[PDB]
């Protein structure tokens, strides 16, 4: 690559798999660095870690 | 970071006469500051209709520093700047 470079088109990329924190969430352990949430109306649990 | 001129509660445990200004200390009991302490002194007013206390020496626990925020006090449950004592 010369002085004017990094202009090649982006090649294909396999999308990443599902985020691995889902395993812990499903098991019931909240992810590290998260905080609990309050939800009513039924039987469910929630957490907020990465504005998600 | 505290908003300009906001409200806090505190407790005075050491009594003093308005005869000799000197160090008087109080303790914040609620709000963000817990167990923080505050040294100050009073002033002598022109007339005996009130009495106010100067609070400037603020010491926050945990950290080794002594900030110099200056503040005054008001009478709780009365919302006045006077003093609850005898004047006759």
């Amino acid at each position: 690559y010369g002085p004017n470079a990094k202009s090649m088109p982006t090649e294909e990329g396999i999308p990443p798999s599902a985020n691995d924190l889902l395993l812990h969430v499903l098991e019931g352990v909240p992810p590290p660095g998260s905080r609990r949430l309050v939800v009513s109306g039924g039987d469910a649990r929630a957490w907020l870690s990465n504005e998600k | 970071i505290i908003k300009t001129g906001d409200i806090m509660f505190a407790v005075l445990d050491t009594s003093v006469n308005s005869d000799e200004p000197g160090p008087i200390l109080a303790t914040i009991v609620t709000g963000k500051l817990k167990g923080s302490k505050l040294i100050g002194s009073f002033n002598l007013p022109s007339n005996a209709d009130k009495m106010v206390i100067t609070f400037n020496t603020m010491s926050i626990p945990g950290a080794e520093k002594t900030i110099s925020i200056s503040a005054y006090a008001i009478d709780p449950n009365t919302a006045r700047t006077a003093l609850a004592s005898r004047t006759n």
Partner: protein, 78 residues
Amino acid sequence: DGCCSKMGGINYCDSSAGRLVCNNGFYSTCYCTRHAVMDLQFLMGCCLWHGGVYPQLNSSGLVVCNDGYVSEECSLQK
């Protein structure tokens, strides 16, 4: 107020269904935990069904949900 009125009386709250249990073996009808099946079909609050109420507060009365959509009815009128 008495959920198990005219019955044996309130025994305990089973959280497996969020239900009070009367002294007679029959289930009561009240709710004794937030984790209960409640069929509520109404809600309050503005900027609903969008990014939610934006955490920051603006000088103007205009309020925008976090998705970028603006809740006119929540914004004060003039």
